[PDB]
């Protein structure tokens with residue numbers, strides 16, 4: 001089957017670093033330079049063997065045609081009102097980018113407001129962040145090119161969709177918040193740096209500042225409002241209170257759900273916004289999260305995890321701010337996670353809970369916190385919502401493994417509330433009643449019960465004969481909840497497969513305790529949990545090791561790469577997307593310094609000793625047993641992935657090919673594909689999305705010799 005040769009790749013045998021007395025060789029360190037002729041030649045040579053392997057069998061074409069047909073359905077966001085008009089996103093089906101529409105009423109004709117498709121031939125310029133002025137008459141929006149986190153902010157006047165001259169550069173990981181006087185907007189920017197800032201560089205991002213842009217002026221006139229020169233990793237994001245009186249600054253350092261919270265009463269500024277604001281440091285530590293919900297005068301409602309790992313709502317009065325005085329508006333639940341909270345129609349709160357990895361949605365009274373109404377949902381997720389304090393209605397969007405989505409609407413001015421379907425689209429070709437979703441709880445190595453969803457055709461025999469696709473992430477307080485994927489349903493219907501999603505530790509599914517269960521010294525729990533999910537699918541007869549594919553992205557790419565090293569005998573195929581592979585060096589590049597809150601950092605002997613045991617780059621080893629080889633592996637990355645710099649996948653694949661690929665017993669391929677004009681994944685155009693899933697499933701099909709089922 002292996003009709004290609006791995007390219008020759010130079011090994012710098014002098015690249016040796018001492019980590020606390022432990023010598024580490026890094027012979028492909030040179031791949032860390034994305035601009036070198038050597039690195040460019042490496043990427044070209046890798047793509048030269050991967051692309052023909054993916055495209056050789058008719059299966060890829062068959063999958064691509066089916067994906068193109070089935071993904072071609074209308075895709076809507078929730079409506080949201082801004083000022084006197086309503087807005088929503090819509091894709092007729094296969095547009096590269098969804099388009100923002102405007103209408104003057106719910107019954108009125110809609111027209112195009114902003115169409116990102118016309119900004120590039122290939123759909124590689126995408127919206128990334130936006131903010132309307134408080135009155136809805138002005139609009140700021142971020143644009144990212146080629147999938148980079150870097151943003152350029154532009155402005156429009158809403159009436160007539162008039163382009164304005166204002167352009168803001170050096171924007172990344174930025175807030176966007178207009179003052180209610182309509183004068184200007186807060187945003188974040190990084191200082192100038194040597195070399196490129198286009199998403200191909202690896203330069204660390206430090207000293208982010210908070211600026212205020214006055215509309216109608218040049219960016220060079222912008223006011224510096226906050227900076228942290230003694231704390232280069234701090235990031236201060238601004239928002240205005242609902243009444244426009246206060247700027248609230250949420251300062252983060254790293255990725256944990258915690259923030260400092262400072263406020264500025266704008267009425268107390270001596271002469272408007274003219275420099276560093278008179279910040280009052282309400283919460284001046286990183287011990288808890290304080291997420292603004294609403295305020296009534298000086299009484300501020302926050303969602304918090306302060307001594308409340310499943311989250312709760314508290315009221316802090318700025319005039320009586322000591323912690324002993326805070327009021328608990330909605331107490332923490334014993335098990336269910338309060339995921340997010342919004343305030344709507346002055347005095348309602350909408351709370352969204354996660355109950356065993358499924359969403360519920362409730363309306364509560366702002367004054368007492370009392371439950372008023374349950375909004376009924378099917379089993380799945382709430383993935384969009386609109387309804388601000390001054391608005392009198394809500395929209396929310398529901399999705400599940402088997403259903404594309406339903407947008408609901410509820411008019412909250414009505415005495416008796418009555419949520420109604422507002423938009424619903426069905427995908428023809430995927431009959432949902434042919435399948436089922438089950439939730440099981442399996443024990444991990446240490447006895448902890450882990451949730452797992454399994455999606456399969458009704459009535460299958462559990463005889464181990466079915467290909468399976470097992471997905472996980474496990475980190476960063478991210479909950480992996482039910483979502484509609486046409487790409488995975490094609491694997492089910494046309495490849496006879498079983499889908500599985502394991503809610504392993506590190507995630508947010510059981511609150512901060514679940515998250516802490518999969519970080520730092522305990523990161524190995526994630527891998528144990530995921531290997532145990534694979535063992536469950538096998539033991540219960542859903543699949544067998546030779547038919548099992550695992551997949552994850554970013555932190556999930558780390559997950560599957562580590563699992564391939566630790567239990568190569570458990571998996572037939574591994575697809576690692578945009579994965580963190582070098583655990584000793586990740587903190588050196590772009591925003592990787594922020595991930596030390598989940599991983600630790602190799603500058604500490606204690607942390608190094610954790611990291612070295614599981615770092616994918618540092619644990620590639622020929623299996624000892626003669627009858628065991630590595631699974632077939634595909635790494636997917638892209639040359640503007642400035643979130644997880646692609647040198648992670650480059651160094652890993654060079655290592656896999658040299659250590660394992662050279663062995664006579666290894667016949668499963670170990671390949672990388674590096675895309676162009678793409679990044680970590682956000683904003684990827686439809687065309688590239690289709691190519692990517694076609695690559696993934698063609699790889700699975702060829703490696704496992706799976707027949708298409710038309």
Ligand SMILES: *C(=N)[C@@H]1CCCN1C(=O)[C@@H]1C[C@H](N=[N+]=N)CN1C(=O)CCCc1ccccc1
Nearest residue numbers: 173252254255476478554555580591594595644
């Ligand atoms: C992929 N999972 C990468 C590598 C490991 C962590 N990664 C992230 O992208 C993390 C996790 C969250 N993403 N998701 N899902 C967010 N994130 C970031 O790096 C966000 C960077 C910007 C930032 C940094 C610190 C505080 C707030 C925002």
